[PDB]
RNA sequence: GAAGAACCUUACCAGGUCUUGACAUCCUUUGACCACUCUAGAGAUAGAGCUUUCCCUUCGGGGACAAAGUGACAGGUGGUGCAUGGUUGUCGUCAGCUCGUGUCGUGAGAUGUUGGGUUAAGUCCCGCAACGAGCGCAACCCUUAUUGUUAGUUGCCAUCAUUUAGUUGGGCACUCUAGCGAGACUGCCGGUGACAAACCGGAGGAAGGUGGGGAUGACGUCAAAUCAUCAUGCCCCUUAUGACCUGGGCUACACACGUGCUACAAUGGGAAGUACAACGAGUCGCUAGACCGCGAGGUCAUGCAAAUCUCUUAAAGCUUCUCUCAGUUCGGAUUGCAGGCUGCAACUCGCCUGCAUGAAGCCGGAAUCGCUAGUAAUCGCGGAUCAGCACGCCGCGGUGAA
């Protein structure tokens, strides 16, 4: 309800332990939650020619990946509001509380 | 393909409409690579600029239409 | 003579089409990813070092 | 050429990156404040002997940390020196900088401490033989398993170019789980400049 | 009431079977057996797991599909149809084994590789 | 190839008249992974084939084969390092493989301009011993024994 | 190289121009430069106009800042891959190359690393004056194929109802998404084998014998390539080979060659109906929808910073009709005219549309290349660079042989 929280990291282990922190912080004061919905984890691509004069032969292809997460909640209390609005670790995932 | 229509510089149409009232000067100079022909070109004498050297002609009436760089050509092949 | 080109790029254009791409610690003029303002071959390099978060080496 | 920086390789798999932040949309300042603060601290260096830097990302303010084999020299006599870094670097950001210091322990057993340590020697017209030598020696008896060291150029400073180095130990390299190191450093009196690369093994 | 179910996958394509009692026959998203299909006569293809168990008829078929092209998809239907009758008596797996039509065929396209024109092709190349 | 033979990928039988010949056949004619039009031009000369002189399109058919598929074969070998071509003992298999080669091949020559009319007359000409495809198998036979005396003891 | 030559970018040529100079540091006076408009100009610039204005004050001062000067000087895509660092190409994904200690030989050297068995392999087993080891092989890694569980939206619709529809009620069953697990190890059967290693067949199983694919490149050879990504010794330019601007090059054409695309048609040309993917891009950008012009497009308006909205109903495919074997209704190079888009500006030197004209060309010598399976062949989709411009390159998927 009215509230909710994406996610978009690299890793996963920082995402996985980033939801249960924040199921923590809803679920203890309230309920109503919803677990850490998976998402298509989007992707890149780039070429670079593994040379630096010739030889267009030899690729040298790198990616990037972004995980994501996504969690609402029903019937936020003050208490949890305000305990989401101070929880602010980790800090190498990006959140977004979003209605 | 300037449906709204055509165009010539103004450091070319102010220093030839300056001969509009008196006799034509024999000699404008320019760069004479981005305008095209207007009616009120009719009878002068422009040299033409080919990144190399100014190239004097003269206007007649059908050479009119296409633009000024055509003249001048920078190739000189033989 | 890069330095007076690169000299060029920092201000601002003649005309809005001249506005070109080109790297920032080296100075390549071609191929340059427009997402992180590197060359071809430094970031190529700097991949390797582990200091572009995100890249890495893709298998599949 | 043939072969593959190691620790370019062993990246995001077993061993992570060293900026851990996360930027979309604002994706070029980042990447070119992080560049401009990695090379400024090269000042430091000269002494300090540092080996590592992060550039962690607050919500609006600059956390890194670092580690060299003298904490004191660093942070200065009242850590004072500490405080010239924070005004340099929030003036070089404009964006309040917060550093942090770990104390590196075992810094004979990195990498390049090391480096920098042989090209020192190298600088001073020295033997490059016994320089690595002794290198390995005090590497591997500090606890290890494997050393190779590599170096180039003109050699002794004469005539055609050359390499050849030695190795203890033993490394093994299209293994994943290897945790090995790797530095590459330049040194040169008046002959060009010369070339060293160094690497260890400490764990699968 | 009773319904049987069962899946299949060839080259990227998924059919969702649905199984019942009826005359035999097969509804293909709402359509007709023989619309979906082309002119295709790979029908045989699609009933030849009846040519083995429960031979030839008489069930109903629901089947959603998506994904591939018509042969993939078609062929994907196939293995619901196995699995199916599978789910029916545990009996028949093995007279499905030795007649096989029961794996899932993992031949897939083939992940290409840079500086070749395709998966194999090797230009042309002057000799001298 | 170097180390030992290989299987051999046996396909299915036909959906009209279940014959592993007749998909063998299908297959010889498709060009560029497009394939319905190939049984397409089958069955309508299939079709062709029944209407004069209506025995069956399959009966005709391993006539005209029966009237093709060779028994001999010079197979060029270098024992004596030399241009000596050898009479061989021709396989099962790889005969109807010509069989239907020279079939198709040679019918794409015979030139009606309508689609299929060019390999209906083929096949219907071969199953009476008219057409160079029965030449072409008497020709081979002919070069076979042409020179089986000093090719044989090998 | 070049993953975007109209100007640039851009080194090169013709012109018009500057000197501690476009760019960096010091120092002397200082002290805050801007920006703005009008003129003459092809601009570079020149010339005038309100002007660049103190951001700390302890009464003393400091930074950004000009401008001038001053000399310290900068500057170079000038030179040498044969003085160099670093980074690649190949032999080669070929199976090899070595060492310590013992022992042999007057010595260069040899033993190990050889013979028999075995193998993708210096992979293993057996015997042997050799005993042991390291970089290599393999394995540890990513993805594809089966699935248990945990979680159900922006995903799914089976059990219900209703609406144009999974939409909206209702549900999380399935599908899918994605974390943790499970699973292939010669594990059991028979046989062959000196009982060893291994090999032939079998069950079970989704896959059986490195399941398919990729990343991963040993010692070294080739004075191979690169001072033009960057760096650098030495040699060199210095009122000029350093620097600013406009215009032209790099797109020149008697000719020889390499790589590609469209074709020489009846499995085809045309016209009309009819369905099915996958990978990814999106805020000054993807355009919904509707209106207009036959078209390239324009107009007003609509969501979308995302599994929601858009690019985008994929094309070959499947069903009918017409065309009859001809340079043809095939082929559409080339060219006249009229338009569209971005662009300060498309003659030199863009992409696209309509009309009109309609070239060579009817399967190509000697010779020569690629390819062992979802491959070859064939048909579409996307995006990198990028106002704009792709038959190239990097990925995806459909059909599917001998
Ligand atoms: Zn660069």
Same mark, same amino acid.
């Given at each position: 309800?009215?509230?909710?929280?994406?996610?978009?990291?690299?890793?996963?282990?920082?995402?996985?332990?980033?939801?249960?922190?924040?199921?923590?912080?809803?679920?203890?004061?309230?309920?109503?939650?919803?677990?850490?919905?998976?998402?298509?984890?989007?992707?890149?691509?780039?070429?670079?020619?593994?040379?630096?004069?010739?030889?267009?032969?030899?690729?040298?292809?790198?990616?990037?990946?972004?995980?994501?997460?996504?969690?609402?909640?029903?019937?936020?209390?003050?208490?949890?509001?305000?305990?989401?609005?101070?929880?602010?670790?980790?800090?190498?995932?990006?959140?977004?509380?979003?209605? | 393909?300037?449906?709204?229509?055509?165009?010539?510089?103004?450091?070319?149409?102010?220093?030839?409409?300056?001969?509009?009232?008196?006799?034509?000067?024999?000699?404008?100079?320019?760069?004479?690579?981005?305008?095209?022909?207007?009616?009120?070109?009719?009878?002068?004498?422009?040299?033409?600029?080919?990144?190399?050297?100014?190239?004097?002609?003269?206007?007649?009436?059908?050479?009119?239409?296409?633009?000024?760089?055509?003249?001048?050509?920078?190739?000189?092949?033989? | 003579?890069?330095?007076?080109?690169?000299?060029?790029?920092?201000?601002?254009?003649?005309?809005?089409?001249?506005?070109?791409?080109?790297?920032?610690?080296?100075?390549?003029?071609?191929?340059?990813?427009?997402?992180?303002?590197?060359?071809?071959?430094?970031?190529?390099?700097?991949?390797?070092?582990?200091?572009?978060?995100?890249?890495?080496?893709?298998?599949? | 050429?043939?072969?593959?920086?190691?620790?370019?390789?062993?990246?995001?798999?077993?061993?992570?990156?060293?900026?851990?932040?996360?930027?979309?949309?604002?994706?070029?300042?980042?990447?070119?404040?992080?560049?401009?603060?990695?090379?400024?601290?090269?000042?430091?260096?000269?002494?300090?002997?540092?080996?590592?830097?992060?550039?962690?990302?607050?919500?609006? @303010? =600059?956390? !890194?940390? &670092?580690?060299?084999? #003298?904490?004191?020299?660093?942070?200065? $006599?009242?850590?004072? %020196?500490?405080?010239?870094?924070?005004?340099?670097?929030?003036?070089?950001?404009?964006? @309040? =900088?917060? !550093?942090? &210091?770990?104390?590196? #322990?075992?810094?004979?057993?990195?990498? $390049?401490?090391?480096? %920098?340590?042989?090209?020192?020697?190298?600088?001073?017209?020295?033997?490059?033989?016994?320089?690595?030598?002794?290198? &390995?020696?005090?590497?591997?008896?500090?606890?290890?398993?494997?050393?190779?060291?590599?170096?180039?150029?003109?050699?002794?400073?004469?005539?055609?170019?050359?390499?050849?180095?030695?190795?203890?130990?033993?490394?093994?390299?299209?293994?994943?789980?290897?945790?090995?190191?790797?530095?590459?450093?330049?040194?040169?009196?008046?002959?060009?400049?010369?070339?060293?690369?160094?690497?260890?093994?400490?764990?699968? | 009431?009773?319904?049987?179910?069962?899946?299949?996958?060839?080259?990227?394509?998924?059919?969702?079977?649905?199984?019942?009692?009826?005359?035999?026959?097969?509804?293909?998203?709402?359509?007709?057996?023989?619309?979906?299909?082309?002119?295709?006569?790979?029908?045989?293809?699609?009933?030849?797991?009846?040519?083995?168990?429960?031979?030839?008829?008489?069930?109903?078929?629901?089947?959603?599909?998506?994904?591939?092209?018509?042969?993939?998809?078609?062929?994907?239907?196939?293995?619901?149809?196995?699995?199916?009758?599978?789910?029916?008596?545990?009996?028949?797996?093995?007279?499905?084994?030795?007649?096989?039509?029961?794996?899932?065929?993992?031949?897939?396209?083939?992940?290409?590789?840079?500086?070749?024109?395709?998966?194999?092709?090797?230009?042309?190349?002057?000799?001298? | 190839?170097?180390?030992?033979?290989?299987?051999?990928?046996?396909?299915?039988?036909?959906?009209?008249?279940?014959?592993?010949?007749?998909?063998?056949?299908?297959?010889?004619?498709?060009?560029?992974?497009?394939?319905?039009?190939?049984?397409?031009?089958?069955?309508?000369?299939?079709?062709?084939?029944?209407?004069?002189?209506?025995?069956?399109?399959?009966?005709?058919?391993?006539?005209?084969?029966?009237?093709?598929?060779?028994?001999?074969?010079?197979?060029?070998?270098?024992?004596?390092?030399?241009?000596?071509?050898?009479?061989?003992?021709?396989?099962?298999?790889?005969?109807?493989?010509?069989?239907?080669?020279?079939?198709?091949?040679?019918?794409?020559?015979?030139?009606?301009?309508?689609?299929?009319?060019?390999?209906?007359?083929?096949?219907?000409?071969?199953?009476?011993?008219?057409?160079?495809?029965?030449?072409?198998?008497?020709?081979?036979?002919?070069?076979?024994?042409?020179?089986?005396?000093?090719?044989?003891?090998?």
């Amino acid at each position: 309800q009215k509230i909710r929280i994406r996610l978009k990291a690299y890793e996963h282990r920082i995402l996985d332990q980033s939801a249960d922190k924040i199921v923590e912080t809803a679920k203890r004061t309230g309920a109503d939650v919803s677990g850490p919905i998976p998402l298509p984890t989007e992707r890149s691509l780039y070429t670079v020619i593994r040379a630096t004069h010739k030889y267009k032969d030899s690729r040298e292809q790198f990616e990037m990946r972004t995980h994501k997460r996504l969690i609402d909640i029903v019937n936020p209390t003050p208490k949890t509001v305000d305990a989401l609005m101070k929880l602010d670790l980790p800090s190498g995932v990006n959140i977004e509380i979003k209605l | 393909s300037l449906k709204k229509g055509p165009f010539v510089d103004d450091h070319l149409m102010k220093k030839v409409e300056a001969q509009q009232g008196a006799e034509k000067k024999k000699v404008i100079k320019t760069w004479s690579r981005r305008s095209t022909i207007f009616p009120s070109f009719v009878g002068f004498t422009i040299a033409v600029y080919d990144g190399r050297k100014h190239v004097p002609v003269y206007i007649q009436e059908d050479m009119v239409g296409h633009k000024l760089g055509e003249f001048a050509p920078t190739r000189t092949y033989r | 003579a890069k330095k007076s080109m690169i000299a060029k790029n920092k201000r601002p254009a003649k005309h809005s089409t001249q506005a070109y791409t080109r790297c920032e610690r080296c100075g390549r003029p071609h191929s340059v990813y427009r997402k992180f303002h590197l060359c071809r071959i430094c970031f190529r390099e700097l991949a390797y070092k582990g200091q572009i978060p995100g890249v890495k080496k893709a298998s599949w | 050429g043939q072969k593959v920086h190691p620790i370019g390789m062993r990246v995001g798999i077993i061993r992570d990156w060293d900026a851990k932040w996360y930027a979309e949309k604002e994706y070029a300042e980042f990447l070119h404040e992080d560049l401009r603060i990695r090379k400024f601290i090269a000042t430091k260096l000269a002494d300090a002997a540092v080996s590592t830097i992060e550039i962690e990302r607050a919500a609006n @303010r =600059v956390n !890194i940390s &670092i580690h060299t084999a #003298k904490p004191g020299m660093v942070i200065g $006599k009242g850590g004072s %020196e500490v405080e010239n870094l924070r005004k340099e670097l929030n003036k070089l950001t404009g964006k @309040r =900088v917060h !550093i942090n &210091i770990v104390e590196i #322990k075992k810094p004979d057993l990195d990498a $390049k401490l090391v480096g %920098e340590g042989i090209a020192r020697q190298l600088e001073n017209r020295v033997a490059f033989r016994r320089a690595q030598k002794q290198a &390995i020696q005090r590497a591997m008896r500090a606890g290890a398993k494997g050393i190779k060291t590599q170096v180039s150029g003109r050699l002794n400073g004469a005539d055609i170019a050359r390499s050849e180095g030695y190795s203890e130990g033993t490394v093994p390299l299209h293994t994943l789980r290897a945790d090995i190191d790797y530095a590459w450093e330049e040194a040169d009196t008046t002959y060009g400049k010369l070339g060293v690369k160094v690497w260890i093994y400490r764990g699968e | 009431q009773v319904q049987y179910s069962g899946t299949g996958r060839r080259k990227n394509a998924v059919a969702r079977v649905r199984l019942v009692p009826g005359t035999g026959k097969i509804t293909v998203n709402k359509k007709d057996v023989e619309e979906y299909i082309p002119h295709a006569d790979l029908r045989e293809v699609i009933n030849q797991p009846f040519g083995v168990t429960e031979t030839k008829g008489a069930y109903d078929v629901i089947v959603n599909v998506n994904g591939g092209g018509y042969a993939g998809q078609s062929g994907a239907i196939r293995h619901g149809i196995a699995r199916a009758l599978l789910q029916v008596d545990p009996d028949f797996r093995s007279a499905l084994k030795r007649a096989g039509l029961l794996t899932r065929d993992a031949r897939m396209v083939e992940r290409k590789k840079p500086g070749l024109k395709k998966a194999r092709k090797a230009s042309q190349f002057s000799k001298r | 190839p170097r180390k030992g033979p290989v299987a051999k990928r046996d396909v299915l039988p036909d959906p009209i008249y279940n014959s592993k010949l007749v998909t063998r056949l299908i297959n010889r004619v498709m060009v560029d992974g497009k394939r319905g039009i190939a049984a397409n031009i089958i069955y309508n000369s299939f079709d062709i084939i029944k209407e004069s002189t209506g025995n069956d399109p399959l009966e005709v058919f391993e006539q005209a084969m029966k009237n093709v598929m060779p028994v001999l074969e010079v197979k060029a070998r270098r024992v004596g390092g030399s241009n000596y071509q050898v009479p061989v003992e021709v396989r099962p298999e790889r005969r109807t493989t010509l069989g239907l080669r020279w079939v198709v091949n040679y019918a794409r020559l015979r030139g009606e301009h309508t689609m299929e009319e060019r390999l209906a007359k083929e096949i219907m000409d071969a199953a009476n011993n008219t057409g160079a495809s029965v030449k072409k198998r008497e020709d081979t036979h002919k070069m076979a024994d042409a020179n089986r005396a000093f090719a044989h003891y090998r």
